[PDB]
Amino acid sequence: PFSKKQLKVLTWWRKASPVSDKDGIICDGSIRAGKTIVMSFSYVMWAMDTFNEQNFGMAGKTIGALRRNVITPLKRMLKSRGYRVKDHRADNYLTITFKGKTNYFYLFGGKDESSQDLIQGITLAGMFFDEVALMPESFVNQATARCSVDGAKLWFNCNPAGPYHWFKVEYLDKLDEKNLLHLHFTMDDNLSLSKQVKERYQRMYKGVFYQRYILGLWVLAEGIIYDMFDQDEHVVPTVPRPYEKYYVSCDYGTQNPTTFGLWGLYNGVWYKVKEYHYDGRKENKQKTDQEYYEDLMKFIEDIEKHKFKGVIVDPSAASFIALLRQKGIKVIKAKNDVLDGIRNVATALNKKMILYNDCCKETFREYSSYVWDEKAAERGEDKPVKQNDHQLDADRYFVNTILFG
């Protein structure tokens, strides 16, 4: 069962609809509202019905993201209803055929290099954006400019960012000016989710991320980032526990602070067991990659190497990664997504996927001074102020790479 609102996405374009004259549709709102899948399916339906031997565009933050989110379940859904699909993987387009008709669906990425050469020249009968909130504005405008065929329709799908964000300002606020339908989506509009499963997702988020991804609201990122951190809840005594696995997470910095952090699993919870924190300026002495390698070994002396699963480090610190690999240390390149990492660290704090030993003094100080960039947030761009963020960046590298995936 599709909800009343999901059905509106499936039927708005059909000639029988009152709102079929509109030049496109925007579906913003909460996560898990069942909007990405119905809107993807409706786009293909529409395209197949309305045109023949015509080109269409589908876009994501990256072509991979687009495939995992949208295409792969869309293809199973299309095959079910009796559409013949043929994915041309390396070429990044599909040919869907249905009741004698055939159309061409090209896959693009927001920042992708190969995409930006194709979108300069291709002609399109329509365009579809998934997570348009994340895509760069310039690519989105250049893609709509390629929709030159008569009867073309623009389809936008996203989750909320800040209310100064270009997509809010230029598309959602200027809704009649571009002649677009708008359907806002909540978890109420996903009938497959039980009141049991829905209350589980509401627990996952608090603060700005709750207001954005649950209430569906374009609310401003302001003040303390991890407002849900709570020394009652998240700090525990620094006493030995029988840890199953281990990692070390590392923000590298010669000029700045370098930090390590021993993470350790125990009954479904990862504990930041201790912290390393070396400042060049304060100590009045920088450190070489050798010296940090040496320190990293002292940092993990006491743990059993059969439980130690590797050092997570930012790809930028390659000079360090080279050395660590020469010394037979397993390196994991960190999933360095800033905004999505911050979002996940909070979700881990809220669900209590992580806890901290009371000895993590530098980390707790950073929690109280990690703040959103206020100036940039009111330009549309949600960013952290990169200052007192060295333990918290390492903690993000760990949570985003190990816990989430």
From TrEMBL:
Signal sequence segment: none
Positions bound to ADP: Q6, R32, A33, G34, K35, T36, I37, N190
Keyword Nucleotide-binding recorded: yes
Annotated coiled-coil segments of the chain: none
Protein's name according to its UniProt entry: Large subunit terminase
Entry annotated with the keyword Nucleotide-binding: yes
Sorted UniProt keywords: Nucleotide-binding
